[PDB]
Structure of putative dehydratase protein:
Amino acid sequence: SLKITSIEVFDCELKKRDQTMSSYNPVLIRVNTDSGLSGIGEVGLAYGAGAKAGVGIIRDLAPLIVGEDPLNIEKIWEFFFRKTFWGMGGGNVFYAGMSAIDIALWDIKGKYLGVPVYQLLGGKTNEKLRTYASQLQFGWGDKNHILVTPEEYAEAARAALDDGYDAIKVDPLEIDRNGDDCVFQNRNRNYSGLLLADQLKMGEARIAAMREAMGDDADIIVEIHSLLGTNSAIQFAKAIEKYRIFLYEEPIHPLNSDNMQKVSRSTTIPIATGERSYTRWGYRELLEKQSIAVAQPDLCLCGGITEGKKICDYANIYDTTVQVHVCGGPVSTVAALHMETAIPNFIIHEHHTNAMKASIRELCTHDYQPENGYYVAPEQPGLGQELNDEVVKEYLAYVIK
Amino acid sequence: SLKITSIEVFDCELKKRDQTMSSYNPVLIRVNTDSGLSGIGEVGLAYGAGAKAGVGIIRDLAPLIVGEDPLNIEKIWEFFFRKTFWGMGGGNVFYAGMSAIDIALWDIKGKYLGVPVYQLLGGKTNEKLRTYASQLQFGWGDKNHILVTPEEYAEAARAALDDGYDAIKVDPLEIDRNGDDCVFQNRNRNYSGLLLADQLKMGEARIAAMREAMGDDADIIVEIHSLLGTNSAIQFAKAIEKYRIFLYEEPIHPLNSDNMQKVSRSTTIPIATGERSYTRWGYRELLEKQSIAVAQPDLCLCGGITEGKKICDYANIYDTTVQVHVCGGPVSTVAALHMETAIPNFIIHEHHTNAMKASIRELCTHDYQPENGYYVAPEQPGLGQELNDEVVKEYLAYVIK
Amino acid sequence: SLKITSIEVFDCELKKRDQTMSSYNPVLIRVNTDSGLSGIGEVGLAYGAGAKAGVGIIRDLAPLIVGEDPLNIEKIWEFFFRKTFWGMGGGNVFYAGMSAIDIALWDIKGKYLGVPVYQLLGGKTNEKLRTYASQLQFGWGDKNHILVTPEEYAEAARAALDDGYDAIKVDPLEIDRNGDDCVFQNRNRNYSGLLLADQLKMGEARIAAMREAMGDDADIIVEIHSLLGTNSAIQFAKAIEKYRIFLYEEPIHPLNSDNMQKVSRSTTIPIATGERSYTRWGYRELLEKQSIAVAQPDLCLCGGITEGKKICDYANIYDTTVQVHVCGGPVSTVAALHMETAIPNFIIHEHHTNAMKASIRELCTHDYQPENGYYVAPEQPGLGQELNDEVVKEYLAYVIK
Amino acid sequence: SLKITSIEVFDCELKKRDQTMSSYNPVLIRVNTDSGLSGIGEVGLAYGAGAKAGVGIIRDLAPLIVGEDPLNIEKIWEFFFRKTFWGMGGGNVFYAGMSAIDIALWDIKGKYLGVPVYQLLGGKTNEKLRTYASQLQFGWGDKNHILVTPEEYAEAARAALDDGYDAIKVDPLEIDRNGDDCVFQNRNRNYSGLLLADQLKMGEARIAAMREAMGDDADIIVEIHSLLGTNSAIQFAKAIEKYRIFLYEEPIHPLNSDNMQKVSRSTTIPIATGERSYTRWGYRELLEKQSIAVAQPDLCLCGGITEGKKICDYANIYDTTVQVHVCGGPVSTVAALHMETAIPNFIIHEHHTNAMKASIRELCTHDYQPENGYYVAPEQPGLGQELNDEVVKEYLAYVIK
Ligand SMILES: [Mg+2]
Ligand SMILES: [Mg+2]
Ligand SMILES: [Mg+2]
Ligand SMILES: [Mg+2]
């Protein structure tokens, strides 16, 4: 049999190699065994305020499974859920720690059994995966900058379509009229109540310009990053329904599920959420209340592959399809690709604007990128990724033995 | 006006000074200002899997408020909620980081204004605070060890009453037949479904013996630590109803609020929970579904004094009274005392079996202990504690400047 | 320590100095202590039928706290709630009496601690406060008269915008086709059922003329003063949705919360209410039923600053923002300014058309007015207002000793 | 036709004529007409904090109907509801002012038409009215003082039965161990959460002793005066169910109707409330949620005879029967008797322990007292009372002409 021998934690402070990417700190792990099979995982706190907590949570959780059999993945998941105290009252950090370990264990099991992770998740259901260009308020391809003017948003939409995408996502309210970023800066605090005329006009004009540039057929997902409250989310939705919006993502935060239901009932645009929703239990009220068209769990936050699969299976009975949230290192991308290949209720894959950055790509050994708007799964045993040790040795923070 | 100059984070690995306390690791902070006024706070992850994540979250949050005016407490809270990404989909670790900072800010403001924190929370509403002896499964007073036999539990109860308490709390199922601890060990996995006869008998016998030793008048709170599921929680409740139980704490975890409601409707014992429920949003479904008689936020987890007050005020409209959850360092205790002194809907104060332990006491410079089953408020400016520098220098982990 | 020594009640029958303002009777109080620190408050019954009851309620409540420590503000509030009989079945008059006393106690506590009241409410969250010109059916600035013709309403909108406002409020149905006032006269009794064509046309034409005059960007709040019933409120709302209405205030009275929900579900205009809703308990059904976008408690009716803060905190979890209702003397204005400065869910401040009247301004020592559409908080200890004794000595009605 | 010429308001400070009755201050009015017909009414704020507000509200409302035709009772009621501002967000004081006027108008109309008021309410439905001896915690008959010991309560019960009653009401928790009164004093603040063992025992012992002294057949109503909260109300109910309790009155206050429902569902004792519930709107949630077996509007608070009748008629469709709340002057009694004589859903009449007191009796010119546990209706035109001018001249406070 196998025993876990050590877990390495990498604090990937990208600013050390790429000062461009200073808002960014992937947290990667490697779980090693006495057989010599290792697996890699990722804690999904690469952006916002969380990376150092993410490193910490691996230090908290890793000691509990040193010496244990990695193949009992359900048992290990349940132990973390039940026997840690915080497993039964956890959130983004705790479940991110479980997720990272869980991903690595799936990687190990695939290598042990000689097959890609999608085989272990039910086989090749989807041979290729429709993909969108994500977060175009930061540009696409050539012109990468913070976009303010409607013409700039139109240009980014054209760039993405020229790159062979037939779907894009944009947050048209994140960037204020001065070019400040409302996700991370105290700007437009009124967003949580009702929009001002200028703000409604700013957001609608960006979407209008993008729809004009793209034509009618390509799809537009409107990302809101939980910036709006129930009333402004509905207000803005009604202003943009005329542009044929595919999905309306995180119109408000997920903490009040009844408010999510009210948003969904009050616009014709289908609602997506999930990146800030963790475990089956974090989807129960969203699904039961018929509030969402699309679930977007992050496999590096929601409980990993074991739990992600369960969220997908559950979503299916409410006609809710799945786009895994992906915004971190290469490990998140491969976990998503295996999940999406296997699940019958896949809808679309998210290709983040920064997924081609050198400092992200160099963390791992393989590069999986879309071609002409489509992704395919890795075919090697396990996830099909390893860490690039030449780079990650500089990011090694802790070894749990 | 004032400016935050640095935040110190203390990783209190108590095992370094007391090998008996290796299950515990308080996480303390100190927020310093350019006036020389400092405030102290606590991240409520002293037990279970979480301490190192708690250290990390302070590394993540502290840099965002270095240089800012500490007096703008509501603004700082809201910024953490809104502009960090994870504040709108947090959990135990994120909200614990917010809590510690918030508590340190109230300490600063009390010191600045020259009054105890209870004055800033509305004044001296409750002159003294009824207190219970908490967690008697580990003994009380003279005989402190893991208790197994009904007679041992009866002895603990007598010891508590002799110490001047007229209320105790006990988890009569945590310890199995062999003395193993179900909270942190993989024992009695069947607890989440239905109890076996031996287990029902084991728990009831402990309660029965305790009630016999105490007499009818002293109160028994039954703690379940979310060890049971809906069905076993009800099964066990109905077996112990005959002993006149004051509160039933965490019969199940709080992740499914409808199941909490079902428990509440299926026993005559009033339900308490809340140590694993964070922010006002954490209490909305519990209160609206009329599921709980007593809310138990931990001020070092639930969002601090600012948010804890709001939880208390909200609970009041549903006739839900409050016992702050306290299991950590001396900072958690004083935050609790100030809150409980101010709120009209205080019910009882939790005095944990280890809150008198040297290795916990020695973190801070003052003593606050109950007398004749009652607590009173600190009366000095601010929280009424400082760090004991001679001790905590050995625990200093990071300074954010 | 401090003890309350006396409470003065001022029956401000403005007609004694200003026959123009004969519909108006502010009720002010002053609470004095043995330290020489005094605080002022206001009973929010300056208009409609209530002022003499308001004077009476201070006579009823004041004796109960002579000799008591004013710093225990929560204790005093709770005593009035619990131990007066009518505190637990009260309404506008009883809660107005509690509010006035509560405001004065906050004033005292701010002076005692040397800081403005907003500091005690959580600090400076909002540095400036967007303000609307309120009740333009009575004119703005130059032409103050009862407005009937659509051109007159357009003129008042222009006057307000010229005064530097970017938002206005108007009740376009209060004034009937003969210039009578439906709020206080038995006219258009059919309003509670369904509107007649002429009435629908009258109201819509006024709003249309105002939107035309203002342009598209400035905001229009439509005040209904509970004149309409569920069916006519919806009927009228649907007629005016085309003009981009910001808020629809008091479309019906608050006594049937399910009817409020039905109104909210049946129009795209966000609903505001609250001036006739008192205490947390008066908002529970409004919020739970997701009926309101904006809460408008009057701090001189709803339970004061202590309770107002609690209403704001509660509203926030439903994405409900707050505009304090202000239509009385200068004390109401300052209480609102301190509240709005501190709360994270402020949306807009109400500047009533009569807030510049000489006979109102002369009641107090300071004048706080908006500049270019914005208010700021007072900065002196306490509320930042005192009574102007030269004037108010003529209004002194009772001293409770 | 007739015209109202003046309204006299009497501030009945009974302490001026009887120092034993200093807790009580009836507020009476007389409405005079140009025909010489007068009517009398009562503002139901004779106890608790409210009398002077009640005098004031008559000053506020009276001027609005001087000169009007008193026969248009529905019109006058509706005008107060609709055209005063506060009538659509009132409460105890506002609706009490409406009530007093309304009762005086029915007195006038009965006199004008030459028939007792019950005839105008539908006729003599109930020839006699079962009556209970109310509030035995203050003694009955020979021994009138604050009662403490179970034997004292048993003695009160025997005294009532000897007086010909076959039903009593008692609040067994209002008086503490030391004889202090929890209704108006800050004692037993914990009552709003959960009862302590001593308090549960104290209340149960009083009920037990009473049931023993009475025998099984006579009825016991348990009054709680809204002293308990949801959880303690249920706790105490379940302790006294064994004594066969007829009604449980005001187990909690009426501000949260969902909690009232929860109480109703959690005990086998039928719930009564309504003295602190006003207008039909005050009863809607109570009746629809099937929370109450018996409604207890006070006609001097709930909106008078006009509105009281409507409450009775509405309660009927939910099988809710009516006991009018009566604790005030002789006017409240006769209004009750006429209402109860007419309504098909009468259940029992409340005879308060002080309704026979000289200082209350002497306010009016006639005697109406129960006999052998039964009341009958007055038979003279109108209400069947006049003011005793020789007494009330000393209480005259205002005349509105
Ligand atoms: Mg997103
Ligand atoms: Mg616990
Ligand atoms: Mg209004
Ligand atoms: Mg009663």
Summary: Chain B has two domains: 1-114+383-401, 115-382. The interface with chain D takes residues 126, 130, 216-219, 246-247, 268, 270, 290, 293-294, 317-319, 321, 344-345, 347 of chain B (CB under 8 Å). Chain B has 13 helices and 13 strands. The domain at 115-382 of chain B is CATH 3.20.20.120 (TIM Barrel).
